[model samples]
Target: SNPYARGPNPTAASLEASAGPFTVRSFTVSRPSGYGAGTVYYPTNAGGTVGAIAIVPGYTARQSSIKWWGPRLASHGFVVITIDTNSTLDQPSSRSSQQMAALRQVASLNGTSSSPIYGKVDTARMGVMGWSMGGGGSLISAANNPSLKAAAPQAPWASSTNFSSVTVPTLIFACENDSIAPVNSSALPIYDSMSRNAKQFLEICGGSHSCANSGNSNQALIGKKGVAWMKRFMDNDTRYSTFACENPNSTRVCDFRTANCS
Candidate 1:
């Protein structure tokens, strides 16, 4: 049986929080080199190695803005890290750099026998996610690092907004009514320019820039898409193919577009 499979079993299926079989634990990294401080979340006794993901918050935002994903993804079956940037005003490129630095720390811990995540992470299977400016950073990371397994950014924003070099598979959560980083001006252009990679676009109706930040109404469906994207691209698990490929007729409330989701 696949340890990461979803089902009644906590280790597999993404049921209620308490339903998961593995005990989730987290800790603060003293300081990740060349980046900001970070907190790591992982499932204990998950049977075998699982993918790890790094998440960052937006400008003027702390980890609290997007920290919710830590447990949300970790509980389902992943090693998650939410980091505080060295400076809240850091640009998308800087945030992108720190996000990778944070991932590197995870890789380092995976080999450290004393770390709870030791041998618990499939280092090669990694993903990145974030929101707002941080979301833009996530895209930049995918552009610069083709080795990344997958990427999903929410209401991303950057100066130039051109990421044509990006080859990593990406799933962007676009906000329908974002006053901050308007999708037509930002997200759409970036997605359209990325003519070389597998990409997906999910526009949340009535959503603001932070609509997908955590406790939003659409999280139920948003979370499912995020998980499926990571599982399919990062883990190469066909289990999520339908979830990632098929347009959710139920998601008609929101808008969705895909390029090479297969």
Candidate 2:
């Protein structure tokens, strides 16, 4: 059955309130097989089992850099795990392994009697998300593990930009003016290379490398994009199709591109 197969309440569509009215909770994951300590966020009362997403942060960063997605995604009827890699400097490839391990560990937790999320997570409908190198790791996760339902990477950076083999549905957030991982040299090439997948590229105007981080001024709008993308692909929900494909002509987005997708 659908836990919180709950209707989308329109009266309060703010990013913080858009996921319905479920109260949220969090627990720590100590030393999982391939990653460092982490946190899991989920709704206390849901309509049924919900989809899950695993998030990893970029190079030289901690969970705090991207942990906001836990409550943000979990509140919307999804189980989310935001993990710290075994090392903060781990590259995208290394982070990818840890990221998948995090997902596997969380899936294992869903059947563990001592866990609160025992029966609340639908592991089959899973997604991965991340930022910077972690964003790159998210892509690496999707590419290496093609079974992932969806992926959303914010200002992703990786050692290599050739991800031509990625077939999972993906969304890439690119900062217009990031010097460290410039759009022209980093994100754009990766987006262009994923020719065999359903993909979308959202270039934020006046964005820094941390353009899609927690404190970005455009989070509400970006949050909706991430939610809608995950809903459409991971949850197999079409209610968010328009939200995912239709554009409002927002000036904040310097460029928007899509291919083989709704």
Candidate 3:
């Protein structure tokens, strides 16, 4: 009996759908507290309060690069924010700070009576996500804040690959053909360094650097994993365990690895 479990029982088909069961709504933050700009997507009703997720784009990229995640995740019963960094050239560390600030603003909005998301978010249950260097920022956030429930970063590029200190559940999406952040040197190595928590590596077959970004053609599989990972970890909902941890065993994924996950 999991109190955090919302929505119906998940299936391979449900999680793969472009949208989940909830009715989705979104708004632009009139005044971005920390990040440059943001679009907040949320479900009108998700049975009860839901977690909040902050997403950032890679170097020089704007919110559109990762905006697909907003409605995709929010429709599945989470408050999702896709943000633009104060500076297009902001680094991972800066991205990490802005990411957390966005989450904090979400929490503040949940408490302010006049806010649209007021009473909608479970402030304690939060997660981080990003693309490219922003993905590295996701890792940095997870490493620095152990209270985070989960992280699902895409083709992350950072100065270092040593995230062995991270204890939060993490799911890394790697691009097989990415020259900018090769899996061998970045994603794989970063995944390899983590031994303290449940983790996974899912490499997209023939993927380029932007394979997992907003315009990717493999949403059926990629969306499923992203939702499953967040559901499983953020809500501690084991209903997503199979979907979250099981290998796709399909052609879309060229390489897969996991540790301490069932």
Point to the candidate with the largest TM-score: 3
Error of 2 at 233 (Å): 0.4
Q: How many backbone clashes does candidate 1 have?
A: 5
lDDT string, candidate 2, 81-109, tens digits: 99999888788999899989989988999
What's the lDDT for candidate 1? 0.82
Local lDDT at 230 for model 1: 80
Tell me the alpha-carbon RMSD of every candidate. 2.7, 2.1, 0.6
Q: Write the per-residue lDDT of candidate 3 for residues 113-206, one digit (tens) a residue.
A: 9878989999999999999999999999999999999999999988999999999999999999999999999999999999999999999999
Clashing pairs in 1: 5-12, 6-12, 6-13, 7-13, 10-20
- The best candidate by lDDT is 3
Error of 2 at 141 (Å): 0.9
Per-residue lDDT for 1-262 in model 1, tens only?
5545542321223532322345678998875776778989998866678899999999999888787778777766789999999998999999999999999999999999988788989888889999988998998888888999899998988888788888888988898899999999998887888888889888888888888886777666777777778877887777777777667665434777889876
Which regions of candidate 2 are displaced past 4 Å? 1-19
Model 1 residue 177 CA deviation in Å: 1.1
Worst 10 residues of 2 by lDDT: 3-12
Candidate 3, residue 190: lDDT? 95
Clash statistics: count for each candidate: 5, 4, 0
Ranking by TM-score: 3, 2, 1
